[PDB]
Amino acid sequence: EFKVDDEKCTKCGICGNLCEAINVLHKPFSPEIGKVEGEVIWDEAYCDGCNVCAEACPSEAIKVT
């Protein structure tokens, strides 16, 4: 079902702030990289076919089914 495109994701919380399934962990910010980088974790136990977060993402980084 769910699939993110880490190629086009900026790790903006506006995708994990909506659903209770999407929890976005920003691993600690270090000037090493100087960038934001984390992971998007989706759990089945909370989803729906709502698909709101597909278009809530600023980018098109989320396709769900």
- What is the C-alpha to C-alpha distance for residues 55 and 59, in angstroms, rounded to an integer? 8
Instruction: Give backbone dihedrals phi and psi of 59, rounded to 5 degrees, phi first.
Output: -80, 170
Amino acid identity, residue 32? E
Site for ligand SF4 in 32-51 (CB under 6 A): 40, 47-48, 50-51
Residue 47 interaction partner, one of ligand SF4, other proteins, none, beta carbon < 5-8 Å per kind: ligand SF4
Residue 31 interaction partner, one of other proteins, ligand SF4, none, beta carbon < 5-8 Å per kind: other proteins
* 12 is an interface residue for other proteins by CB under 8 A: yes
β-strand partners of 38: 26
> Is position 50 annotated in a ligand binding site?
yes
> Is position 47 annotated in a ligand binding site?
yes
